[PDB]
């Protein structure tokens, strides 16, 4: 009568999200005295982010994790979290609280249910920063005319355009070559993903722009969740909440470690002045009006309430 629950996700061994799911597995095993077992299938072993979330939504997999921008393959409401400067690291504990215990978390539960899903962990996945191979970036104006790799996220593209940059959507697999060969001048990502992907080798400058925020959303198929005994639901819910407390902290530690690696490898990491941050915020705010008709005002308001 052991319950085997399969959990797929895209992330590499030792990544902050992976470690969170290892913690989740451990806690589910402890709380259930081994009666419930999470079977981990990381590093895209069951497919890409979209493939495994499709499977979780349809019920051929019990659980999957998708980045918040990729949750756009499934619903549009999640776009709220991609808006430039809707959140900043200073207010992160309040954001977490609101997701964990507040109206925001309840709304997100409702949205997930509408697409066949039950949230279990809102894994931290960090704030992206601009980096370059050769052109020094220390100011907002330094970003003008920079050729910058993007994902296929429309908000990412619009942000770059708003800052006067020249966005080029390139697949992840083509990105290192593009940086190395000079078909783009830079990119925007977390230091840990860049260091872990060894893009560090080809970079020379970084700014703490923090111009995008994202999470990695661990979801369970809702019909499957609703089929479980209450005690097993509770074990999963609690394991998720507890693992997330560790995962958010581990993320901070790994991001520090990645920034130190940048500095060790000779990358100049500029701490933006107040004046320059404010330019980034104001230049990117028109993006919110561009996408206004696609993101519910109520959701924007719940996220903004966490930042006051
Ligand atoms: Cl049990
Ligand atoms: Cl892409």
UniProtKB/Swiss-Prot annotation:
It catalyses: 2-hydroxyethane-1-sulfonate(out) + Na(+)(out) = 2-hydroxyethane-1-sulfonate(in) + Na(+)(in). InterPro entries: DctP_fam, TRAP_DctP, TRAP_DctP_sf. One of its GO terms (biological process) is transmembrane transport. It holds the Pfam family DctP. Keywords: Periplasm, Signal, Transport. It comes from the Bacteria. GO terms for cellular component: outer membrane-bounded periplasmic space. It is found in: Periplasm. Induction: Highly up-regulated in the presence of isethionate. Disruption phenotype: Cells lacking this gene lose the ability to grow with isethionate as the terminal electron acceptor. Pathway: Organosulfur degradation; alkanesulfonate degradation. Belongs to the bacterial solute-binding protein 7 family. Part of the tripartite ATP-independent periplasmic (TRAP) transport system DctPQM involved in the uptake of isethionate (2-hydroxyethanesulfonate), which is then catabolized by enzymes encoded by adjacent genes in the locus. The DctP subunit is the solute-binding protein. Thereby is involved in an anaerobic respiration pathway that converts the sulfonate isethionate to ammonia, acetate and sulfide. The complex comprises the periplasmic solute receptor protein DctP, and the fused transmembrane protein DctMQ. NCBIfam families: dctP, TRAP_S1. This is Isethionate-binding periplasmic protein DctP.
């Amino acid at each position: 009568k052991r319950i085997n629950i399969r959990l797929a996700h895209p992330m590499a061994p030792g990544n902050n999200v992976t470690v969170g799911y290892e913690k989740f597995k451990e806690l589910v095993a402890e709380k259930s005295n081994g009666r419930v077992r999470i079977q981990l299938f990381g590093n895209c072993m069951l497919g890409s982010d979209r493939v495994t979330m499709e499977a979780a939504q349809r019920g051929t997999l019990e659980m999957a994790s998708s980045s918040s921008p990729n949750m756009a393959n499934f619903s549009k409401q999640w776009m709220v979290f991609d808006l430039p400067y809707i959140t900043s690291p200073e207010h992160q504990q309040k954001l977490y609280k609101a997701i964990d215990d507040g109206e925001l978390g309840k709304k997100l539960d409702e949205i997930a249910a509408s697409i066949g899903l039950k949230p279990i962990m809102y894994s931290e996945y960090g704030y992206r920063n601009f980096v370059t191979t050769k052109k020094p970036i220390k100011t907002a104006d330094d970003l003008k005319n920079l050729k910058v790799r993007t994902t296929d996220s429309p908000i990412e593209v619009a942000v770059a355009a708003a800052l006067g940059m020249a966005p080029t959507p390139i697949s992840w697999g083509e990105t290192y070559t593009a940086l190395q060969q000079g078909t783009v001048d830079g990119e925007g990502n977390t230091f840990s993903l860049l260091n872990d992907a060894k893009h560090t080798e080809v970079l020379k400058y970084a700014i703490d722009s923090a111009h995008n925020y994202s999470m990695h959303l661990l979801m369970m198929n809702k019909a499957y969740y609703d089929s479980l005994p209450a005690n097993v639901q509770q074990i999963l819910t609690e394991a998720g909440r507890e693992a997330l407390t560790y995962q958010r902290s581990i993320t901070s530690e790994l991001e520090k470690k990645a920034e130190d690696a940048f500095i060790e490898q000779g990358i100049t990491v500029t701490r933006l002045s107040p004046e320059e941050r404010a330019k980034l915020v104001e230049r990117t705010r028109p993006v919110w009006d561009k996408f206004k008709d696609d993101i519910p005002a109520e959701l924007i308001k719940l996220v903004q309430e966490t930042q006051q």
